[PDB]
Amino acid sequence: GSHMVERPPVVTIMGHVDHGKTTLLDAIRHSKVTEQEAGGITQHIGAYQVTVNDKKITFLDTPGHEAFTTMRARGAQVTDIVILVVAADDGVMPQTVEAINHAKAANVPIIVAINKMDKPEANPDRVMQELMEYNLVPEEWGGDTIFCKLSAKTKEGLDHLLEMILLVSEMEELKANP
């Protein structure tokens, strides 16, 4: 809330390249409403700020010291968001872990983005158990991990992705899961 200062909810997109985290920004680039200046993939910029529902979704963080919140602050719990991208049957790659291991310990929710799920389904449950293997129990299961079985290409789950993101800005203001 804004009572304790409305800290900008930086929705950091994490996962790994192959899972299609670029596809997220790319597909979402084809459905922008505000942005900054340039949402093009060039190392001076790239990500942007999306105004859906008019909630300030600032995508991608600025790695000054640590990617996802510099690890030296316990008197300032920032509203960082861990978007955890996945892809069909891959589950969790190295980067998927090192980001979650880094993320989960800030007392922040994490959001699986099952890419390539626009098929019937690779194996959600298996993949989901990989997440809860890092103790990221899905919200289906009652942990703190929002599983979005989406698609950026078909543009089905792209919608459902932001739907879950803002859902976080809703429930985190109250009590989250419990």
UniProtKB/Swiss-Prot annotation:
Segments of this protein annotated with the region G4: 115-118
Localization per record: Cytoplasm
Positions annotated to bind GTP: 15-22, 61-65, 115-118
Record domain tr-type G: where: 6-175
Location of region: G5: 151-153
Top-level taxon of origin: Bacteria
Region feature (G1): 15-22
Region (G2) residue spans: 40-44
Chain spans, region G3: 61-64
Record's function text: One of the essential components for the initiation of protein synthesis. Protects formylmethionyl-tRNA from spontaneous hydrolysis and promotes its binding to the 30S ribosomal subunits. Also involved in the hydrolysis of GTP during the formation of the 70S ribosomal complex.
Similarity comment: family membership: Belongs to the TRAFAC class translation factor GTPase superfamily. Classic translation factor GTPase family. IF-2 subfamily.
Protein name: Translation initiation factor IF-2
Species classification: Bacteria, Bacillati, Bacillota, Bacilli, Bacillales
Positions spanned in the full protein: 241 to 414 of 741
